[PDB]
UniProtKB/Swiss-Prot annotation:
It comes from Bacillus subtilis (strain 168). This is Endoglucanase. The keyword Mitochondrion does not apply. GO terms for biological process: cellulose catabolic process; glucan catabolic process. GO terms for molecular function: cellulase activity; cellulose binding; glucan exo-1,3-beta-glucosidase activity. Belongs to the glycosyl hydrolase 5 (cellulase A) family. Residues 4-149 form the CBM3 domain. The keyword tRNA-binding does not apply. Keywords: Carbohydrate metabolism, Cellulose degradation, Glycosidase, Hydrolase, Polysaccharide degradation, Signal.
Amino acid sequence: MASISVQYRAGDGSMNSNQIRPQLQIKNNGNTTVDLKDVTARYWYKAKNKGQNFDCDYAQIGCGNVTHKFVTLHKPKQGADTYLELGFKNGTLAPGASTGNIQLRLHNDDWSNYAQSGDYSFFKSNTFKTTKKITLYDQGKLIWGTEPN
């Protein structure tokens, strides 16, 4: 399988703000290329039955090349009742290459504050960290990380 992983950190100050601010990178750790069009990422969290809204503020690969959708889970899980799924229109990663930064913001329809501490894919961190809690897929097959249970 493709060997890719996600580096992430929450945007500073975002935790109890009115925005979820995932900062992500996807790196190809393997010895094969990766076609990003086949790759999706899922950021799992509790939207708590509030309508969700997406912005891409900047991506090294170009925000216009990033796709998104929100998916409500059948029923809530620990740490998640929704995921944001990211996809890509194009782009490849050679072995060792990274997407570079993908800087996103999510907000509730009513711009109310989130309380993100319990969100499966959320954590505060001083720097980008590898995380197993943002999952990656190759044509929909899980290839990085662990989904909430």
